[PDB]
């Protein structure tokens, strides 16, 4: 039981790391999928 409680804590720590990494990559622009949409957005707006 005490071992289980320790594992519960790690899940929270790991979850924050994964979420931060995903959000952080978008800021740097490493996420290629997000960039494609953004440039598409800019092109449409200028064309409009």
């Amino acid at each position: 039981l005490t071992l289980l409680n320790q594992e519960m804590q790690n899940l929270g720590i790991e979850f924050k790391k994964y979420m931060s990494a995903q959000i952080n990559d978008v800021v740097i622009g490493n996420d290629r999928e997000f960039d494609q949409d953004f440039t598409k957005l800019k092109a449409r707006m200028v064309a409009r």
Binding site: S20, N24, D25, V27, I28
Partner: protein
């Protein structure tokens, strides 16, 4: 040391800087130098 500095990239240092400030999504344009020193030293320490 030689391998680490030869493969050094400015973007990775910038990426680390943003994580250090969860309340902001930009950098002063100078923190890359600071993060490089900490990143360079901390990685070197781990090898030791």
């Amino acid at each position: 040391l030689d391998e680490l500095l030869k493969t050094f990239s400015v973007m990775n240092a910038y990426k680390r800087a943003t994580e250090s400030h969860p309340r902001n999504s930009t950098a002063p344009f100078i923190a890359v130098l600071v993060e490089a020193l900490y990143y360079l030293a901390n990685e070197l320490e781990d090898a030791f």
